[PDB]
Design a binder for these strands. Structure first.
Length: 1168
RNA sequence: GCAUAAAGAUGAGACGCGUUUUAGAGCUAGAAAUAGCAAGUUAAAAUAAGGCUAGUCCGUUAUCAACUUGAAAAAGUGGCACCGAGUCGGUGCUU
DNA sequence: TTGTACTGTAGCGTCTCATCTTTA
DNA sequence: TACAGTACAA
């Protein structure tokens, strides 16, 4: 009467089985609903549920940030146009409207088709004058003429729209660092500080380290070669620590005024050089070198002194492109005149035309043109330009990601500074335009929402619209920066209402050192029995050692104190070398505000909000010591709150928990032992400190991929309980996969299972016990059932069918129950040192084996009947039990369910196809007709919809009644579910029968003649749906065959398996018969099938291993799901696609429940 | 609990490309189908259609068999034993 | 004039910062 | 892998 549910959870499957206490799987007649004639169907209680993998929220987040970036960039351009509008209205007022209209075709425009100047002659004169935008930018930076206001807008908008990265946070200016040589300036500044003035000889110094990975192995030698040496690490002769600090902190080499540990930084050189900058320079020339190295790396050499180096570099790129284009054209004319048409005219060959007008990248163009350029002569400098990747370049390439925003800011500042005198409004709000360019939302502020986002945490002081100008007096940056951290650091697991402390808390580190000092016991001459460290001894250990040094050694008790009378307190040592007062550290009277200091230096990292938090302590401290504290910075958070640390007194000892850790006398108790005890009043308070599955699924943290596996397992268990007449099982057996995103997600998809199933299943209790254990949830490791498979010839072959999930589940259930009934006293080990446990798990399994062999090559015998022994009940019966297992594995009917899903995601594929006279193109925008503008293709159908209505076909318009499938794409889903009838009537259908509309998601199952099933992949595509239930003998033979010598068993055993697979060669022809019969009944791919037969016939002489391996490959023909392309020995067999859904409109639609036991068949041929 | 690993999540702020349509007067010999030649590097705009609480916000993760109640949330709906096994069949009790 | 049947398409490279988490 | 685009076949 009782039973047990076995489960095998995966990332793409949930295998379920129901066994009774003698390992048989029962079967029941289930009621069939619907309008078909069949009223009851026999089904076995074993099966699997398949689904598509659950996806992480990553891609959605990336596209969301891209959306926000485009919105904010368009807002930047709108701010700049708002600035320009009043004066633009006085000169060519339609200008911004033409720029907005630019995308439209010639007929859709409402102004002249030429955007910039609004007529042909001025537009072509402009494009002849400035071939690129960079010519215009350099002209506006350098020339001193009053320019047309439109050109000013074009340049400023081009800098503001595409504006470079923000990684370099210093206020870099390139014009002081344009030159590649700085050696003489650095050496002059050196010897006016270090009065030597030795004989010196100049040399270029920036590029010389750019030749290699920047390191001293070049530099010490080259700098001694530059300046005649009196030192080696402090010559100030282009030493690398001036260019970039060392990544490990190291003290100053030939220091200027004070000892300080230099570091690689772009955040602290404006502060940590207070050896001078708070008391007053080599470091000026040093930072000039520091700019110079990457600036020469990212700008080409400038021999003319211009204020716009980036525009000049791009002009140089353009000019060399033009020269090499002319040269290459002439050369391929005069040497290879038949290749000229292919290179410069055919735009699909990766030539020059395919590099400009086609879609070939620079690398593809180089790879194509290298043989052409090399087989010629006179093309040598072009070849070296190609080897340096500098041949026929473009002004906007993939490697413009190195330009910092400072260079664009310099060019924009130069343009405004030149042109302010002729247009006064440009001078009146130059700062505003520079702010538009330079502004970023801080990462700790997040989206600028008004309470309508689920991603925002910002709090605003006022309620005005946030522009880049009033951002500092509308956003409470302090509170927002706080909430950026507070939303992330979780509460403690015990009292989930208080935020945890920082890990560098004095209280938390006190807790840690006292916790792992509490259970330190010393055995010595002074006592005959071991005693733990008393509170005085723990005090002495902390006070002498921890409060002076971070490392620990307990031996001071034996060597000093008894005559005299993974632990650290790092923050105490830090604050003792900063404040340098031991009193104010040991003074607990202000320890709360000391923790406030630690908390603020943990919450905040941007410097002035740290100072903002230390305004309130200005009266405690003098100015230089907050200059010392602001440089300190703490990272990481403690695991438990302050209420558990200091907000509680025990009702028996009278002590706070940290007082026990400080002093619990002898018989010391640690933190965990304290809170696990109920005689001390902690456990009941923790239980008092403590309601839906769908949140319990989430706050048990992990990716949203866990939710599918766990939740489908839970719903399977719920419906399986419902199937058995609400009678709860006595066991549930869980695969755990303990001893690869699939495996780590799988282990997360198994860890939660025992908790959720035990909490859901066992819910009734009494006054004597607060849970009556009724459903023992067993946890098993995969090794157990894997050894059970490989030890009694129950081999799995994953390629044949999806029955292996259900079979694995059944195996989990049988070995789990048969394990705990043999060893009842070991419930507390499975039911909800490493080598010893490994040997335990290795030697537990042998009780199944009739013959047991030790690690001695000798024999012992075990009886056929296994018994518990504590009570004589039989728990395994060698014989009928193996017969039962083989019978269950050989069953042909297993409930395999593909979970039907309404598809969600992108509207279509992301590439934008060119224009065509086609109706399949999806409009990019409401007014943008794709016949003129192009659009997207491959839309994704959300779910199909069976309709039955009249359509007006024939040039004689009259109503033929029709019934056909229709694909409701993700774009149309909302407009369809709003009102299906009007949407269908807009699709042309007329007199739609509203009650006959059937929503069909993906993998909707239909049954056809001969029991041939098809899964609806879309309105225009089907999938295979049946399972080849190949008998157990053939799968055993195939596993023993395809792994022919990699089996690695003991010698005589693998040899007799060798002769067995040799002796049963006819199984190959029998499996060919099985696949041919199944594929002629259900797969209906004749050409692929007789290709398979012919390829099998032509390789009958091949060895058993290779033949069997290709037979394993052969099951891709009959597999459930999409038709795939497989290969035999030689031939690659392309799939027969099921590319028409006319076939299922007269079939039996099957509505399977999650277990698949409850069905609702709808015969579609009786509709319309 | 801490130290020593690794693998993975969730969120925010930025950058550079790419694609698309338009603008950058193509010339000559010609009924031309055309053929020769010249040119090519850049810009604007969009970058899920869109939505309304109109924010420098939100729009691709998760959830979803059918049927009966329920706006929704949700709740509810399907007899058993035995002999067999080509995707489940048969026989026998029961209302 | 419209159903099969075959080869072909399919947005991606980072960077700065936060916190977590499970399994050894 | 599910559409799409050419190119047979009615």
């Amino acid at each position: 009467k009782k039973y047990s549910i076995g489960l095998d959870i995966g990332t793409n499957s949930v295998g379920w089985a129901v066994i009774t206490d003698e390992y048989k799987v029962p079967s029941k007649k289930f009621k069939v609903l619907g309008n078909t004639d069949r009223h009851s169907i026999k089904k076995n209680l074993i099966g699997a549920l398949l689904f598509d993998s659950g996806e992480t929220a990553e891609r959605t987040r990336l596209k969301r940030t891209a959306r926000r970036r485009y919105t904010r960039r368009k807002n930047r351009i709108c701010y700049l146009q708002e600035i320009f509008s009043n004066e633009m209205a006085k000169v060519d007022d339609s200008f911004f409207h033409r720029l907005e209209e630019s995308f439209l075709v010639e007929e859709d425009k409402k102004h002249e088709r030429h955007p910039i100047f609004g007529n042909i002659v001025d537009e072509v004169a402009y494009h002849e004058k400035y071939p690129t935008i960079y010519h215009l930018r350099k002209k506006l930076v350098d020339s001193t003429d009053k320019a047309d206001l439109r050109l000013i807008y074009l340049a400023l908008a081009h800098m503001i729209k595409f504006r470079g990265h923000f990684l370099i946070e210093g206020d870099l200016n390139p014009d002081n660092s344009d030159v590649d040589k700085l050696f003489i300036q650095l050496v002059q500044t050196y010897n006016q500080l270090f009065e030597e003035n030795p004989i010196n000889a100049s040399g270029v110094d920036a590029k010389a380290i750019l030749s290699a990975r920047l390191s001293k192995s070049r530099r010490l030698e080259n700098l001694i070669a530059q300046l005649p040496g009196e030192k080696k690490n402090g010559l100030f002769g282009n030493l690398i620590a001036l260019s970039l600090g060392l990544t490990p902190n190291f003290k100053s080499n030939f220091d200027l005024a004070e000892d300080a540990k230099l570091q690689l930084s772009k955040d602290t050189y404006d502060d940590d050089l207070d050896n001078l900058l708070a008391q007053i320079d080599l470091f000026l020339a040093a930072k000039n070198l520091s700019d110079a190295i990457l600036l020469s790396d990212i700008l080409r050499v400038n021999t003319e002194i211009t204020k716009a180096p980036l525009s000049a570099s791009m002009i140089k790129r353009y000019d060399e492109h033009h020269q090499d284009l002319t040269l290459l054209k002439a050369l391929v004319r005069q040497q290879l005149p038949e290749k000229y048409k292919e290179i410069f005219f055919d735009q699909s060959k990766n030539g020059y035309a395919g590099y400009i007008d086609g879609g070939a990248s620079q690398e593809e163009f180089y790879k194509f043109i290298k043989p052409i350029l090399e087989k010629m002569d006179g093309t040598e400098e072009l070849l070296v330009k190609l080897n340096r990747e500098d041949l026929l370049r473009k002004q906007r390439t993939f490697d413009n990601g190195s330009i910092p925003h400072q260079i664009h800011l310099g060019e924009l500042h130069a343009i405004l500074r030149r042109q302010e005198d002729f247009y006064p409004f440009l001078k009146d709000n130059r700062e505003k335009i520079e702010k538009i360019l330079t502004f970023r939302i801080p990462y700790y502020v997040g989206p600028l929402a008004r309470g309508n986002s689920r991603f925002a945490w910002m709090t605003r002081k006022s309620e005005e619209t946030i522009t880049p100008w009033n951002f500092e007096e509308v956003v409470d940056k302090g509170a927002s920066a706080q909430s950026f951290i507070e939303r992330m650091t979780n509460f403690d697991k015990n009292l989930p209402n208080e935020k945890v402390l920082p890990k560098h808390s004095l209280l938390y580190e006190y807790f840690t050192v006292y916790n792992e000092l509490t259970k330190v016991k010393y055995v010595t001459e002074g006592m005959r029995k071991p005693a733990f460290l008393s509170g005085e001894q723990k005090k002495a250990i902390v006070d002498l050692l921890f409060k002076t040094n971070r490392k620990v050694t307990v031996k001071q008790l034996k060597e000093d104190y008894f005559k005299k009378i993974n632990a650290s307190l790092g923050t105490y040592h830090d604050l003792l070398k900063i404040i340098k007062d031991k009193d104010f550290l040991d003074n607990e009277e202000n320890e709360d505000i000391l923790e406030d200091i630690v908390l603020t230096l943990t919450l905040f990292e941007d410097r002035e909000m740290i100072e903002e938090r230390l305004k309130t302590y200005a009266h405690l401290f003098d100015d230089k010591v907050m200059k010392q504290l602001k440089r300190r910075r703490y990272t990481g958070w403690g695991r438990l709150s302050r209420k558990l640390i200091n907000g509680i007194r025990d009702k028996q000892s009278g002590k706070t928990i940290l007082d026990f850790l400080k002093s619990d006398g002898f018989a010391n108790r640690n933190f965990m032992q304290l809170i696990h005890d109920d005689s001390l009043t902690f456990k009941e308070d923790i239980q008092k400190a403590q309601d839906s599955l769908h949140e319990h699924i989430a706050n048990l943290a992990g990716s949203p991929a866990i939710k599918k596996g766990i939740l489908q397992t839970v719903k399977v268990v719920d419906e399986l309980v419902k199937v058995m007449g609400r009678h709860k099982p006595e066991n549930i057996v869980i695969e755990m996969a303990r001893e690869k995103r699939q495996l780590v997600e799988t282990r997360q998809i198994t860890k939660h299972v025992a908790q959720i199933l035990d909490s859901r299943m066992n819910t009734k209790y009494d006054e004597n016990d607060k849970l009556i254990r009724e459903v023992k949830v067993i946890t098993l490791k995969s090794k157990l059932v894997s050894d059970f498979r490989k030890d009694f010839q129950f081999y799995k072959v994953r390629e044949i069918n999806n029955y292996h999930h259900a079979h694995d589940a059944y195996l989990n259930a049988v070995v789990g129950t048969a394990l705990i009934k043999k060893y009842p006293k070991l419930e507390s080990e499975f039911v909800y040192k490493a080598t010893a446990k490994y040997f335990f798990y290795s030697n537990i399994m042998n009780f199944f084996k009739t013959e047991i062999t030790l690690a001695n090559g000798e024999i012992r015998k075990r009886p056929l009947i296994e018994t518990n022994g504590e009570t004589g009940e039989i728990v395994w019966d060698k014989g009928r039990d193996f017969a039962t297992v083989r019978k269950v594995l050989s069953m042909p009917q297993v409930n395999i369910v593909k979970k039907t899903e309404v598809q969600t995601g992108g509207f279509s594929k992301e590439s934008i196809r060119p224009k065509r006279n086609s109706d399949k193109l999806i409009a990019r925008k409401k007014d943008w007709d794709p016949k003129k503008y192009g659009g997207f293709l491959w839309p994704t159908v959300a779910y199909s919809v069976l309709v039955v209505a009249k359509v007006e076909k024939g040039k004689s318009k009259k109503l033929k009644s029709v019934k056909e499938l229709l694909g409701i794409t993700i774009m149309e889903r909302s407009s369809f579910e709003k009102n299906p009838i009007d949407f269908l009537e807009a699709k042309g259908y007329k007199e739609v029968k509203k009650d006959l509309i059937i929503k069909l998601p993906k993998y909707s199952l239909f049954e056809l003649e001969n029991g041939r099933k098809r899964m609806l992949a879309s309105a225009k595509q089907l999938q295979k749906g049946n399972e080849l239930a190949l008998p157990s003998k053939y799968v055993n033979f195939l596993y023993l065959a395809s792994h022919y010598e990699k089996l690695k068993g003991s010698p005589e055993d693998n040899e007799q398996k060798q002769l067995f697979v040799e002796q049963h060669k006819h199984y190959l022809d029998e499996i060919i018969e099985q696949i041919s019969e199944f594929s002629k009944r259900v797969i209906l791919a004749d050409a692929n099938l007789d290709k398979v037969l012919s390829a099998y016939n032509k390789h009958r002489d091949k060895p058993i291993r290779e033949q069997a391996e290709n037979i394993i490959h052969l099951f891709t023909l009959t597999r459930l799901g999409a038709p795939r392309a497989f290969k035999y020995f030689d031939t690659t067999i392309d799939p027969k696609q099921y590319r028409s859904t006319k076939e299922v409109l007269d079939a039996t639609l099957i509505h399977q429940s999650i277990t698949g036991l409850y069905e609702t068949r709808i015969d579609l041929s009786q509709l319309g």
